[PDB]
Design a protein around this ligand. Structure first.
Ligand SMILES: CCCCCCCCCCCCCC(=O)O
Lengths: 90, 92
């Protein structure tokens, strides 16, 4: 996994993550794809650091949307979308 | 607008509820909210109605009562009915 792959997977989620509402089907599909790449501990740590940079990338990101994205998409997300996540604990 | 692929993808988490009953999940209610939000114009609503109709007929074990009660169980006012047999021309 690479940070560009992660960015591409999270792109459809930016409207939901910065404006609220509901994640679209495209957003949930991208998150599902990225979750499928974060299997191994090293994949999980790398994807986590990429997701952290991406989260800090988007302005006025709403943490309620980030926290509720896994339940709104039906995913047990192995890498949380946080600006402040310590990826070593993943 | 809305496309049949969007309708399929948003209603997919609802298939367990639509075929077995019970309660709709969080993902199902989220997809139903998204579909409600994409059906803005009356033309969007008729297009969505035909897509949802195809999706409903896709499962031969679909419970029409669960389809009818899905919006209320989710707390959503869905502007397009979910029916296997609806004539989508008669909707507004
Ligand atoms: C069960 C709720 C029925 C919705 C009909 C009332 C109209 C409000 C939303 C209808 C379709 C959305 C279009 C819009 O709000 O511009």
């Amino acid at each position: 996994v690479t940070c560009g792959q992660v960015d591409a997977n999270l792109a459809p989620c930016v409207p939901f993550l910065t404006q609220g509402g509901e994640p679209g089907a495209a957003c949930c599909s991208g998150v599902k794809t990225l979750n499928g790449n974060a299997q191994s501990p090293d994949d999980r740590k790398t994807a986590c650091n990429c997701i952290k940079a991406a989260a800090n990338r988007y302005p006025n990101l709403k943490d309620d949307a980030a926290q509720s994205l896994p339940s709104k998409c039906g995913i047990s997300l192995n890498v949380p979308i946080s600006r402040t996540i310590n990826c070593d604990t993943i």
